Design a protein around this ligand. Structure first.
Ligand code: QTW
Ligand code: MG
Ligand code: ZN
Length: 806
């Protein structure tokens, strides 16, 4: 055993030791209890960043902890390979997205291996390979025939300069983010998953996820947005029926979740596309311009509430069916066509958005709810205005004195008896649009035949292979310009037909990959029945909070779809969920010659803050998440090259709890490396005193008080670390606990015969308690202390007798 700790001399040897023993290569072995620990697989972007290292170190800590406790642990890794980054690098570097992807995969796989993650690489998947996406094409065809996947026209944002479709996030002031050209709204046929058919299942099954953060489940409930409200029909006044057709000439239908406040409606609002808006705008040009501006908007869902609410009056009126009030119809920008009836009522006294809307236009506010003896001021909104449980009705005629649920049922009775309304349940959730006008994605297995219609590709002909010999040029997605791809024969009639050229939303690959890991080479289905029944569901899932809504919902949706097809037998894909925090770092910049800022990487800066190149000052700016935006990313490969994998892993687990943001710190890195030197020196100095002995065990009567105190600290540390790994999942406090054990060990004279035995017991436990976090150095130090295989010695047991004081 060498005196000094040298990671480059031990880390490759420890990795070869694990790989030779195949401790991470697992099968469906019924002799050991399974454990499925999964970290969200990465985009093969080029190289790992610090977020990857934190996520996969966390997953490796939990996996190795369960491994030491005797579980048959599967920790798989793969590549979410489809998407736009490969197309953009293709347009910048004149390479094929496939070639760019596969080279990134090879390099990033080397980095992951150098970090010592206990990963079953024999289960690796690449989602851009036909052997993977053939099965999501298969599920697509099966659901398309059942109507769960359907085709209908939708509206997209067309950029005519870049010749591409853009998301709402890519539109700024009505113009493309890169081209700067005005975007055009176009109706094109697209495919949709009928996810609203599973809305009630996806909402209620969240209650089963006892080991998910309540934050994530709340976000999913709000996204699904179930409401039990009332359909209310307002009869159109006789003086307001010009230009109206059908039922729109008879009544205005609306949906409200507050029918107990129907006596407090002071106006109604309709969407820009509503027929009442169209009829009233046929004359007035200001209404036409307001309708045009609403349609030209491209506001994303995450900013819908922040959008300034505006409206225009129409001069048309409707009648409240409960009190006969004649209310004016307004066109408003917050009423969205396709959501319910595309029309709402407004009770400014008990809905804060209606309050601010009415306060802006001086529209009437009428109180209909009272809570205690609270004072109502029509000029200032108070939180009790919207109270839905402790409120009682006022100014509502025959409904006065009722609470929410009683007034709800009475209003429903009044409306139904006169045919003016009925109860109704609504969901904010929209159907899942999966069509993408992009090349680097999974082809949609549909053939268009003018005789047979939109025909799904048969199962024998799957997959529809995406050609990899493609370099996108920019002037449109190349698939729609490659007759060698889309020209084909109809699988139903053999006649001339055309393949679909749109590709799938890349969220689809990530919606079922956790199942594919169970049998990644199975060629007769998405997942083999024998492996699905063994591994069941993912026991532990680790990823970033940015996937709390869409990805998780999609994955839960796919699981229930695959269960209904009979491929799996679990209702939920992920039992436990851990959301890791961001990795942030200081920023540095120099002022431009044009009044701007040039952002400088931290690796090119030395703190006396001075640029390393010319020794000239640099401005220290705010700390934020690492990104290429302000050029503040710290390359983990340089951290590995300079300190080793164990130092990188230890710093990430010690700097902050997994949920809390991790602040990059040079001294924090150095403190981690110096602790590994201390651990190395501790075992070296111990073995230099007389070599290893048998660790203390059994009756501790007769041990000195100092050695009894060390054993108490030892097994209290084991219980604390076990609770930190297994229950709390706070790895920073576990490292501190082992440090406190080593501190007391340093203060204890362990030179006697019984002292050596206790010292052996301390060090054998300490290297095993830290093995999940820093396995390279712990595997090396364990082999110097004991000749048994560390993974066969197992997780340290707590000696209860060591915790009983006299
Ligand atoms: C399941 C599917 C849907 C996952 C999907 N393929 C994915 O998110 N793949 S992914 O490759 O993007 O990420 C894979 C997993 O590990 C990383 C987590 C990142 C969380 C956000 N973050 C990032 C940072 C730090 N950035 C840097 O240092 C940096 C950045 C840019 C340039 C230079 C440096 N700090 N926080 C992800 O959420 C996920 O769990
Ligand atoms: Mg349960
Ligand atoms: Zn045909």
């Amino acid at each position: 055993m060498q005196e000094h700790y040298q990671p480059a001399a031990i880390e490759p040897a420890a990795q070869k030791k694990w790989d030779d023993a195949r401790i991470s290569n697992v099968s469906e072995d019924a002799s050991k209890p399974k454990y499925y620990c999964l970290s969200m697989f990465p985009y093969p972007s080029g190289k790992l960043h610090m977020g990857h290292v934190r996520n996969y170190t966390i997953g490796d800590v939990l996996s190795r902890f369960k491994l030491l406790n005797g579980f048959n642990v599967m920790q798989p890794m793969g590549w979410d390979a489809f998407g736009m980054p490969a197309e953009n690098a293709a347009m910048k570097n004149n390479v094929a997205p496939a070639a760019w992807t596969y080279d990134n995969i090879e390099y990033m796989k080397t980095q992951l291996k150098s970090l010592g993650f206990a990963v079953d690489w024999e289960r690796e998947v690449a989602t851009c390979k036909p052997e993977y996406y053939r099965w999501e094409q298969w599920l697509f065809t099966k659901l398309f025939e059942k109507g769960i996947v359907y085709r209908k026209n939708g509206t997209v944002n067309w950029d005519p300069v870049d010749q591409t479709v853009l998301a709402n996030e890519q539109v700024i002031d009505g113009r493309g983010w890169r081209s700067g050209a005005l975007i055009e709204k176009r109706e094109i046929p697209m495919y949709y998953f009928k996810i609203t058919d599973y809305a009630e299942e996806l909402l209620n099954d969240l209650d089963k996820l006892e080991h998910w953060p309540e934050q994530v489940k709340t976000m999913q409930r709000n996204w699904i947005g179930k409401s039990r409200g009332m359909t209310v029909r307002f009869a159109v006044s006789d003086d307001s029926k010009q230009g109206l057709e059908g039922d729109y000439a008879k009544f205005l239908q609306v949906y409200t979740t507050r029918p107990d406040t129907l006596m407090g409606a002071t106006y109604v609002a309709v969407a820009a596309e509503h027929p009442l808006a169209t009829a009233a705008a046929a004359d007035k040009p200001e209404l036409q311009a307001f309708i045009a501006e609403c349609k030209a908007g491209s506001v994303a869902e995450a900013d819908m509430a922040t959008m300034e609410k505006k409206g225009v009056p129409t001069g048309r009126y409707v009648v409240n069916p409960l009190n006969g009030d004649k209310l004016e119809v307004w066109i408003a920008n917050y009423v969205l066509w396709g959501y319910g009836d595309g029309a709402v009522m407004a009770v400014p006294a008990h809905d804060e958005r209606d309050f601010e809307f009415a306060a802006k236009y001086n529209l009437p506010k009428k109180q209909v709810i009272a809570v205690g003896d609270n004072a109502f001021d029509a000029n200032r909104w108070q939180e009790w205005y919207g109270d839905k449980e402790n409120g009682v009705l006022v100014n509502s005629g025959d409904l006065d004195g009722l609470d929410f649920q009683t007034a709800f049922d009475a209003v429903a009775a009044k409306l139904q008896s006169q045919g003016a309304g009925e109860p109704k349940t609504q969901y904010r959730l929209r159907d899942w649009g999966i069509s993408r006008q992009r090349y680097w994605g999974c082809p949609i297995p549909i053939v268009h035949c003018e005789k047979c219609g939109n025909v799904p590709v048969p199962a024998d002909q799957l997959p529809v292979v995406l050609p990899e010999n493609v370099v996108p040029d920019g002037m449109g997605s190349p698939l729609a310009k490659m007759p060698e791809f889309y020209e084909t024969s109809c699988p139903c009639c053999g006649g001339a037909a055309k393949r679909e050229t749109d590709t799938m939303d890349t969220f689809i690959e990530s919606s079922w990959y956790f199942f594919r890991y169970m049998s990644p080479k199975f060629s007769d289905g998405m997942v083999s029945a024998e492996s699905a029944k063994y591994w069941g569901a993912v026991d532990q899932y680790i990823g970033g909070i940015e996937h709390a809504i869409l990805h998780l919902l999609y994955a839960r949706f796919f699981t229930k779809l695959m269960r209904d097809e009979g491929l799996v037998n679990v209702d939920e894909p992920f039992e436990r969920l851990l959301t890791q925090g961001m990795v942030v770092c200081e920023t540095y910049y120099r002022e431009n010659d044009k009044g701007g800022k040039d952002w400088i990487n931290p690796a090119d800066v030395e703190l006396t803050a001075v640029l390393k190149a010319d020794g000239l000052p640099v401005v220290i700016s705010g700390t934020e998440k690492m990104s290429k935006s302000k050029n503040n990313g710290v390359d983990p490969q340089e951290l590995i090259n300079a300190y080793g994998a164990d130092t990188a892993r230890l710093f990430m687990m010690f700097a902050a709890p997994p949920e809390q943001s991790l602040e990059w710190s040079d001294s924090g890195v150095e403190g981690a490396h110096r602790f590994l030197r201390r651990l190395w020196r501790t075992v070296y100095e111990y073995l230099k005193q007389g070599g290893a002995v048998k660790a203390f065990a059994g009756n501790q009567d007769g041990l000195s008080k100092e050695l009894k105190d060390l054993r108490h600290k030892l097994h209290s540390t084991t219980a604390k670390v076990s609770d930190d790994y297994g229950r709390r999942q706070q790895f920073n406090t576990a490292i501190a606990a082992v440090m406190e054990l080593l501190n007391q060990y340093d203060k204890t004279d362990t030179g006697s015969e019984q002292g050596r035995a206790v010292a052996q017991e301390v060090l054998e436990a300490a290297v095993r308690l830290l093995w999940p976090i820093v396995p390279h150095i712990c595997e090396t130090l364990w082999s110097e202390l004991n000749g048994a295989k560390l993974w066969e010695a197992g997780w340290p047991t707590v000696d209860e007798a060591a915790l009983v004081k006299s």
